[PDB]
Amino acid sequence: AVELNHTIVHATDRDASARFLADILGLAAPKPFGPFMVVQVDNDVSLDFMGGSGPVRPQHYAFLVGDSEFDEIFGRIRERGLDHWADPGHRRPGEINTNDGGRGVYWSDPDGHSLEILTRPYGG
Amino acid sequence: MAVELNHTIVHATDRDASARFLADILGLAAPKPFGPFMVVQVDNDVSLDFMGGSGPVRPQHYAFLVGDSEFDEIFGRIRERGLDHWADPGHRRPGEINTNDGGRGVYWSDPDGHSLEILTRPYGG
Numbered sequence: 615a616v617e618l619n620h621t622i623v624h625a626t627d628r629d630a631s632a633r634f635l636a637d638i639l640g641l642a643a644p645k646p647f648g649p650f651m652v653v654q655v656d657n658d659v660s661l662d663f664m665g666g667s668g669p670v671r672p673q674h675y676a677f678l679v680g681d682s683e684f685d686e687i688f689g690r691i692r693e694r695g696l697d698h699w700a701d702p703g704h705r706r707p708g709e710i711n712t713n714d715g716g717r718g719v720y721w722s723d724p725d726g727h728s729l730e731i732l733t734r735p736y737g738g
Numbered sequence: 739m740a741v742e743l744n745h746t747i748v749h750a751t752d753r754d755a756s757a758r759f760l761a762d763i764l765g766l767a768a769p770k771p772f773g774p775f776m777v778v779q780v781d782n783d784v785s786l787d788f789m790g791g792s793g794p795v796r797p798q799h800y801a802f803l804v805g806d807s808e809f810d811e812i813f814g815r816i817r818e819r820g821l822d823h824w825a826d827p828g829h830r831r832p833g834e835i836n837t838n839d840g841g842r843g844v845y846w847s848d849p850d851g852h853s854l855e856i857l858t859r860p861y862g863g
């Protein structure tokens with residue numbers, strides 16, 4: 615009976631970064647809550663975007679998506695012209711990985727947060 | 739929607755001590771090594787990958803929804819370790835809990851200063 619419920623994502627432009635993630639992932643538009651702009655995903659966790667007082671240090675947020683959703687999100691990445699890579703080290707641009715019997719790709723948010731989607735989880 | 743948060747990296751100086759600290763206090767299974775990370779798993783299919791070698795860590799915030807009984811057990815372990823704790827994210831109200839959303843909640847800090855929090859009733863859901 616222990617779940618991760620939310621975490622804060624620091625941003626330069628709080629509203630733009632929240633809209634960016636929700637748009638690319640195909641989620642509902644974010645909602646204001648306290649000082650945050652909240653992006654909700656399906657396993658009962660939300661990402662609370664907060665505006666930046668200081669240097670934004672990039673974090674890593676990876677999402678398990680359906681096979682069809684993978685194609686749609688990948689299409690939006692190319693549609694916006696976002697650089698992307700097969701690997702967390704960004705040594706293989708313009709490729710996807712096929713780790714763990716699934717498919718996965720990495721890209722960056724407006725502040726350089728490392729974003730990643732995958733279709734089959736490690737282990738599970 | 740078919741979109742879930744699957745994992746995120748938790749930066750630490752001492753990867754293993756930070757991982758053991760979170761799993762022990764939260765009452766989770768012992769962490770597992772995965773590449774350079776020590777992974778802590780929670781029940782809604784998200785894993786927290788702790789990585790070592792981050793100098794001064796930039797504090798992040800991780801809040802956990804727990805059952806009513808688990809709240810008492812996790813709060814009991816916080817008190818038993820003698821950890822400072824607060825009702826509010828601003829750490830202005832020490833040694834008390836909040837009752838946000840009709841529930842119960844408390845804040846504390848991990849070995850590197852990450853803002854940790856448990857709550858029993860979420861807004862909306």
Ligand SMILES: [Fe+2]
Pocket residue numbers: 674676702730745
């Ligand atoms: Fe990842």
Ligand SMILES: [Fe+2]
Pocket residue numbers: 799801855
């Ligand atoms: Fe919180």
